């Protein structure tokens, strides 16, 4: 029979008022003999009717993928509202239901600290700029780097780690040619998270 998977909005979509967050209900293993799928959606128990079905997609393995998308309000999501997708289909003895929401719990403000390259790293062709982000809850976040308004893309960020006080931390490392560091370029770590003022902070880093 068919199976269902429900997926949250992207963190960035829920935190930028200029973007459009949505939740997605994916039905896989839809049969050729019974392709018709019905979706009901509910928000904190109350049925909403503004979902929209994506084009049907046939798969390599002779079954359909059917997808419903529901737009959501930044604040509903961030306030922890619960979104339920219910799926009905002839090849189902009984409808399937799935629910998702933000993680439960008091949100906590990330502390953002920038850390220069170790003196010992100064012999290398390239050096590491660290952005430490700690004490934040829930774990939904975005970290990006830039210099003079342009995005610096040569970075990697660790997954969030659960800390001993029940908040999360992570580190972002950006790698630059030592000469760019020597030339006094200012680099900036940008963090977006719900419990920040205007959802956004930015910390800078330059040769001292």
């Amino acid at each position: 029979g068919p199976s269902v998977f429900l997926f949250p909005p992207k963190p960035k979509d829920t935190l930028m008022i200029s973007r459009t967050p949505e939740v997605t209900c994916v039905v896989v293993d839809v049969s050729h003999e019974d392709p018709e799928v019905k979706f009901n959606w509910y928000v904190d128990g109350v049925e909403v009717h503004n979902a929209k079905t994506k084009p049907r997609e046939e798969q390599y393995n002779s079954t359909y993928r059917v997808v419903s998308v529901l737009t959501v309000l930044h604040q509903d999501w961030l306030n922890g509202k619960e979104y339920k997708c219910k799926v009905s289909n002839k090849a189902l003895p009984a409808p399937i239901e799935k629910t998702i929401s933000k993680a439960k719990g008091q949100p906590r403000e990330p502390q953002v600290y920038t850390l220069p390259p170790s003196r010992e790293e100064m012999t290398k062709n390239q050096v590491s700029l660290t952005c430490l982000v700690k004490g934040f809850y829930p774990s939904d976040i975005a970290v990006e780097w830039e210099s003079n308004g342009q995005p610096e893309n040569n970075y990697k960020t660790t997954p969030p780690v659960l800390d001993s006080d029940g908040s999360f931390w992570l580190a972002s490392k950006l790698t630059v040619d030592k000469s760019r560091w020597q030339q006094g370029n200012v680099f900036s770590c940008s963090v977006m998270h719900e419990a920040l003022h205007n959802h956004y902070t930015q910390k800078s880093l330059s040769l001292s």
Binding site: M16, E146, H197, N198
Partner: peptide, 13 residues
Amino acid sequence: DCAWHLGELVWCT
């Protein structure tokens, strides 16, 4: 006040 990211609007309080 308002916050922008690479010229794109984030949030205003």
